[PDB]
Design a binder for these strands. Structure first.
Lengths: 52, 68, 121, 150, 191
RNA sequence: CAUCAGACACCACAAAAGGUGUUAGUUCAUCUAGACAGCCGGACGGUGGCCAUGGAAGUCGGAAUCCGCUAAGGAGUGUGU
């Protein structure tokens, strides 16, 4: 029982992210490049994988 | 009680600034900015003060607070 | 085919200007396809509604100073979510059809233009 | 007197009415047999606009142009056994699909008979509608009977 | 490309007045006083009139003009925070353990106290900054409200509260229990 | 701009592959014939199309990939059942 009006906001802050392919950085979900300097600001991204 | 933004008032380049040439063959004369080229070069002319019409850098010359 | 569609727009706008004499500029905003389709079905007799890009109407009236310059007094009135109604009926019946019919709980007429002048109607 | 409106649907002869019309004071098993008097020609999948006035089941028939194009087609099937698609291509009806489609409440905002006769005559994906050609590419060649219906 | 001049226009409404000495910017209005130190950014303020202040950057690169635009954004945000003021609504997320949030005075330091988070025993404690008051919502269940002048103070206390309720060593998409920023509005009820 | 700066031949090393970090340039299309981004609405009708019919209406699945009004709206981009 999460009452999914509450769970949608949590998934905004915990699920709706993108993840860098080289440094696994938890990026905002519409980003085009990773913000870090250690992976050279790459463009290889992925959606953060949901539940099942 | 109002908007107390104070001055930050410079002297601007424009067409008609009178300038003091301080380096070169002139070296201390008056002239006037005729037509401004870019961020650094200008075009000056000093006809009564004698310096011929020529382009110059803004390092060789200093701006005076008079205008026309 | 962008240039040819814009040339088509110029051609049809010059066509529908010089054939009609009664103009109803309408301030229609956020109008639904349920309202608009019953406007397309109703006005098959006298009036021709023309919506579309009102800032392309800006350039269309920019280029139409040579023929009928009396349309010069319309670009300050193309401001807002407006469209055109081209008809030959001057004031009454078209304003009674557009405003009164199909209201729910934005179909008004904001400008009336007849042969050069503007009318409050 | 009250107003109840339902949209009954595809059924062969007497083919879940109880969940949709229980609150309108109508029957469930008698309402399934009350729709057999309309869609029985008309053995093709269509809709039925039922209008119950709070004390009886009074179903009407909705005018469907695609079902009218299917009414100018082959009806051969009985129930649950044709084993491939239960579909059949059939006769052209070059003028029967131009009067019946222009009389099905004049939908889609048509300003001509070649408009509705191509809207409900070029949507053929189960029938051929020609003797030596096909549909959906004859809208620019159908220029007959436009002044007759309008 | 070394832009020759770039400008922005800050609109100052009626009830407030700015006060800019060299880059020390105070804005005074119907909710109070705000100060901000812009000496680190090297932009030029020019009053055109009582309602409109033009800011400008001459001879600047690309990062310099970006700094100009965010200077405009900061000054506008102080002016909004002193006209209307900011108000963040945060609603809890809890699956089985109701998070118990109070405000206690520990030697005048005003800590927001988070208890019973996922059945923990660690009494989590958050400082409240200056200017921001914290209320609890009437007739909306399990909501906390931060209201104050500065954007950074209210928002930063909101984020510092949110990040005291992270979940360690779990699947952070299954255990979603935490305290989350729901709404970002103004103190004035009309706006 | 470098929380690994760079610095002058031989000479005391660094590469493929990347960067919405910044600066220029080439080509094409939109382009000033008000675009792009944002906000406010539409996002139709034939059509639950033909179907496998407990049920499929864009949406377990298959092939056709249409027309009219258009300013625009897809036999539909997923979700929901």
């Amino acid at each position: 029982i999460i009452e999914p009006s509450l769970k949608a906001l949590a998934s905004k802050y915990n699920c709706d992210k993108s993840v860098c392919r080289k440094c696994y950085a938890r990026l905002p979900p519409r980003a085009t490049n990773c913000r870090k300097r250690k992976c050279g600001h790459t463009n290889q991204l992925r959606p953060k994988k949901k539940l099942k | 009680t109002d908007s107390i933004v104070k001055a930050s008032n410079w002297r601007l380049v424009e067409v008609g600034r009178v300038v003091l040439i301080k380096k070169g063959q002139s070296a201390g004369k008056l002239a006037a900015i005729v037509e401004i080229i870019d961020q650094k070069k200008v075009l000056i002319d000093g006809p009564k003060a004698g310096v011929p019409r020529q382009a110059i850098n803004l390092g060789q010359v200093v701006l005076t607070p008079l205008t026309f | 085919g962008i240039r040819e569609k814009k040339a088509e727009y110029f051609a049809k706008l010059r066509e529908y200007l010089e054939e009609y004499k009664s103009l109803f500029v309408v301030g229609v905003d956020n109008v639904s396809s349920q309202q608009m389709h019953e406007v397309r079905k109703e006005l098959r007799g006298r009036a021709v509604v023309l919506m579309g890009k009102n800032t392309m109407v800006r350039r269309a009236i920019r280029g139409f100073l040579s023929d009928l310059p009396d349309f010069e007094k319309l670009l300050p009135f193309v401001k807002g979510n407006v469209g055109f109604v081209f008809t030959n009926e001057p004031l009454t019946e078209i304003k009674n059809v557009i405003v009164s019919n199909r209201v729910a709980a934005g179909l008004t007429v904001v400008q009336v233009y007849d042969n050069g002048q503007v009318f409050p109607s | 007197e009250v107003k109840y409106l339902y949209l009954r649907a595809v059924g062969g002869e007497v083919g879940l009415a109880p969940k949709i019309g229980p609150l309108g004071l109508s029957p469930k098993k008698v309402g399934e047999d009350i729709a057999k008097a309309t869609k029985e020609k008309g053995i093709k999948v269509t809709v039925q606009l039922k209008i119950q006035n709070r004390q009886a089941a009074a179903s009407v028939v909705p005018s469907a142009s695609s079902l009218v194009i299917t009414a100018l087609k082959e009806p051969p099937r009985d129930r649950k056994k044709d084993k491939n698609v239960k579909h059949s291509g059939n006769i052209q009806l070059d003028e029967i699909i131009e009067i019946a489609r222009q009389m099905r409440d004049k939908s889609f905002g048509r300003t001509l008979a070649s408009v509705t006769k191509e809207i409900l005559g070029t949507a053929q994906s189960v029938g051929c509608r020609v003797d030596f050609k096909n549909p959906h590419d004859i809208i620019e060649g159908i220029n007959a009977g436009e002044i007759e219906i309008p | 490309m070394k832009y020759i001049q770039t400008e922005q226009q800050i609109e100052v409404p009626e009830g407030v007045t700015v006060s800019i000495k060299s880059r020390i910017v105070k804005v005074v209005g119907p909710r109070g006083t705000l100060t901000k130190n812009l000496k680190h950014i090297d932009v030029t303020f020019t009053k055109v009139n009582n309602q409109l202040i033009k800011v400008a950057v001459h001879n600047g690169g690309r990062k310099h003009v970006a700094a100009l635009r965010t200077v405009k954004s900061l000054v506008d945000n102080m002016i909004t925070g002193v006209t209307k003021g900011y108000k963040y609504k945060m609603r809890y997320v809890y699956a089985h353990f109701p998070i118990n949030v109070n405000i206690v005075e520990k030697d005048g330091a005003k800590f927001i106290e988070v208890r019973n988070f996922l059945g923990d025993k660690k009494i989590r404690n958050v400082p409240v900054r200056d200017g921001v008051t914290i209320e609890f919502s009437t007739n909306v269940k399990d909501e906390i409200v931060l209201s104050g002048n500065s954007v950074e103070d209210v928002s930063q206390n909101a984020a510092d509260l949110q990040q005291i309720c992270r979940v360690r060593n779990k699947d952070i998409r299954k255990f979603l229990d935490g305290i989350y920023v729901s709404h970002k509005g103004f103190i004035t009820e009309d706006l």
